[PDB]
Design a protein around this nucleic acid. Sequence first.
DNA 1: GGTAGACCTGGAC
DNA 2: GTCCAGGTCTAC
Length: 314
Amino acid sequence: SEFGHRTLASTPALWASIPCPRSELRLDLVLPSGQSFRWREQSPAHWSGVLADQVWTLTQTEEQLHCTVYRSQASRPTPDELEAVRKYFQLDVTLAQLYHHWGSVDSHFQEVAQKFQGVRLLRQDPIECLFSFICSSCNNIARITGMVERLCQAFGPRLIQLDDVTYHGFPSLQALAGPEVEAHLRKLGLGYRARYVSASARAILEEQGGLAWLQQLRESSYEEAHKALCILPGVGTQVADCICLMALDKPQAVPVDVHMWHIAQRDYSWHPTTSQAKGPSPQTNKELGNFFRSLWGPYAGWAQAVLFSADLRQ
DNA sequence: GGTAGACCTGGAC
DNA sequence: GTCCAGGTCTAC
Ligand SMILES: [Ca+2]
Ligand SMILES: [Ca+2]
């Protein structure tokens, strides 16, 4: 059928697959795990969302990642469009190689890795990543997903509509820094986060040099990027790390939240050594992050995703 | 120089 | 009706 969300069976000629074994990527373990909040399983095993300013539907078989895009005449995705999908999932980074290494240096990682293959990091857009995680503060994933959706619906550009779903592109800096946005976001249920959304948008455009400043961070060292990000209102060590890890190419960045503290204590009998406190605090979180980096290496941020993801399913 | 309390809310024991 | 989720900010 020419309407609604497509499926592999429904409209064969509209799909193109990317070679990708299930071992290298599990959509069901990556898309809804708190990295990106804009993907939905509209129909069993099919995930739809905005990717590179267009709407897509993804679904995988044992060895392939099937992709279909909605733009004027319907047709299978082009190589360039697909190249964008390969880049979004950073498929050049071999998960099997990382799993092997982590497992080799962490008997526990190896035990959990057995049942949670295919967990990797998406390479996201800095702006979408920054505001989505500014909303992550003291918040659960489902609720975060709700705010972000309402936000994009209210300030994002309309793309296309499938069934009763109107997909929007993520809002721009200009739109987010616009007048009365805070109040509007409060009516959308963002709470105090509404202020930070507004404040960081203006801070970027009016004090840091705009979009480029943010994008430039992809060429800056992890320490540099993390330092710079914390300048923005509503951005702490936690959010700063999520952004470094998920959108600024800093794979050693490790977000330290309650989940990771629980993992640290329950699975490694970890405890602060250079800190006064016995629990989460600026000093102890920095220490935990260093512990995980020292344990997993340059891609500690990725290893962190595998466990964080497994800890949600539980 | 580290820490307790304010800031918002839909859903859960 | 408290308790809780990928925290951050700032007054002692
Ligand atoms: Ca929390
Ligand atoms: Ca900050």
